[PDB]
Design an enzyme around this catalytic site. Structure first.
Site, PDB file in Angstrom:
ATOM      1  N   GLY A 297     -18.065  45.814  36.019  1.00 44.92           N
ATOM      2  CA  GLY A 297     -16.946  45.815  35.247  1.00 44.92           C
ATOM      3  C   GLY A 297     -15.694  45.207  35.748  1.00 44.92           C
TER       4      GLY A 297
ATOM      5  CB  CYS B 286     -16.624  40.161  35.655  1.00 43.94           C
ATOM      6  SG  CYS B 286     -18.136  40.297  36.643  1.00 43.94           S
TER       7      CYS B 286
ATOM      8  CG  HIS C 116     -20.543  37.022  32.663  1.00 42.02           C
ATOM      9  ND1 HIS C 116     -19.640  36.506  33.592  1.00 42.02           N
ATOM     10  CD2 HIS C 116     -20.513  38.336  32.748  1.00 42.02           C
ATOM     11  CE1 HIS C 116     -19.121  37.503  34.413  1.00 42.02           C
ATOM     12  NE2 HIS C 116     -19.433  38.714  33.688  1.00 42.02           N
TER      13      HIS C 116
END
Lengths: 306, 306
Positions: free
Chosen positions: B143, B145, B41
């Site tokens: 932020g 991930c 993603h």
């Protein structure tokens, strides 16, 4: 979201841990540029620990009696010096993994990360607080002396702690990196009393602010209180008194959450006098005091380091 | 003595974290030899996250649309490939800090360390368990991930987890390093139900053995019990049932402490049905399930790593 007792990344410290051997005894040392810092009781056997004359023992030792090892490479000790409780072992090669570092003497209630090591090899890392009685509730087995505590100021490692002794009570005592013990402790295998251990109230308040930020709000009460009146109750439950400096430090948390510091104190006051009644705060059934107001802001804002 | 939720030393992983940018979105990537693993993603904007067609989105992206940065050096993406939920970004230079590593898919109840990162820079490290419902109760801001979970087999890093999503319930979901989610979760910004979260009983038992080792013995009761009878009570309190394999795993702890596993279960059974009555175990008012039997033996024996 979420909240965890996060330790600082340990990499910059892992590269500084060495194995120091003097006689039969082997513990951990801190290899910064060309000095290896380690507890001076490395020169002691089990018998010497009961009543050590460190000056007389060190004089019996020479440079070639110190074996400093890093991985499978050996360091030559070209000089030895004793600074109050630390041995400065001057070796011939500067640690190429030497980070930007600082020696700092922290105050009780401040937090740091411990890199627990055995034989100079890292085994794990955890975050703890310096208790108000200058002990640490650590996890240290035999051969972990010399493990260091540290903070990271984004590229600068601030070494604040070196483990020396496990008190007969199972708690841990040590020094700053100048060899000055935190607290009244001496590096002798004798019964030593640590003071009454109080709860770090400014830290508990900081953690309550973390609870609110992460959605835990049930403890927000219908009361307010005065700083004088809050401290009266804090004293009863072995909480350290709150000063205006503690109020000033909580400012940013007060501003982010819209909850005045004195309102949080009233919430904590009621938590103290009436308990948590089988309920939790951030997954905890006890009030947590090992997060400073800076830890909370760091974790809630996501500051990074080198 | 003492017991702490110790994380693995993070150094071997810090050297693998990079910043990956695709469009406006920036998250963390894992730089092993010449592949950068990151959540797929990264190619999504906030709108795309509500209903992403990853194949169609990736096809709109090209190699030059991926900015991979490590410190102040830039990596050129010479290839991109999607493995189930992970982006494999082939870059031109192999990570010189690449450790001996392994990709492992862990089982629920197993523990690992998380290196929480933002912008590819490490911010902290903590130990957690994979819950039985395949979520993790982490600490992840926007932020984070791409942060990874790992274990260390003394010189070999076993990467087991990559963070992808914070569920609307504030818990965290992610994949193994082959991009296969742990649990029924998808990388889409939709309401997703995690299962009932149970307590890891074999871990609680392991931690009770740590309590005994460190001097906490008050919960050692006057009762015994059967595995069938213990499991009956475990089911009522949302504890996962105990098998003979769990009994076999606790063997070494039983041998060290002289307490048969079924006797510890009777102690735990009474802890469940009657609570801890305002008393603690290893400083905890709740029963801890984020220590495996191996963690306890590791910590109580002081195993080290490279």
């Amino acid at each position: 979201s979420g909240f965890r007792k996060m330790a600082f990344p340990s990499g910059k410290v892992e590269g500084c841990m060495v194995q120091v051997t003097c006689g039969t005894t082997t513990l951990n040392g801190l290899w910064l540029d060309d000095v290896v810092y380690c507890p001076r009781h490395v020169i002691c056997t089990s018998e010497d620990m009961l009543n050590p004359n460190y000056e007389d023992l060190l004089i019996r030792k020479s440079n070639h009696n110190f074996l400093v090892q890093a991985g499978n490479v050996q360091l030559r000790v070209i000089g030895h010096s004793m600074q109050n409780c630390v041995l400065k072992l001057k070796v011939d090669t500067a640690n190429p993994k030497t980070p930007k570092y600082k020696f700092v003497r922290i105050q009780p209630g401040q937090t740091f990360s411990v890199l627990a090591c055995y034989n100079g090899s890292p085994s794990g890392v955890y975050q703890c607080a310096m208790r108000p009685n200058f002990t640490i509730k650590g996890s240290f087995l035999n051969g972990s002396c010399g493990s260091v505590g540290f903070n990271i100021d984004y590229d600068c490692v601030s070494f604040c702690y070196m483990h020396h002794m496990e008190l007969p009570t199972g708690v841990h005592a040590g020094t700053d990196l100048e060899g000055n013990f935190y607290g009244p402790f001496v590096d002798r295998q004798t019964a030593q009393a640590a003071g009454t251990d109080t709860t770090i109230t400014v830290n508990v308040l900081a953690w309550l602010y973390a609870a609110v930020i992460n959605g835990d709000r049930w403890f927000l009460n219908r009361f307010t209180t005065t700083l004088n009146d809050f401290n009266l109750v804090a004293m009863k439950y072995n909480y350290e008194p709150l000063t205006q400096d503690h109020v000033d430090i909580l400012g940013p948390l007060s501003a982010q959450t819209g909850i005045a510091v004195l309102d949080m104190c009233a919430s904590l006051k009621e938590l103290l006098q009436n308990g948590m009644n089988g309920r939790t705060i951030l997954g905890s059934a006890l009030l947590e005091d090992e997060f400073t107001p800076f830890d909370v802001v760091r974790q809630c804002s996501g500051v990074t380091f080198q």
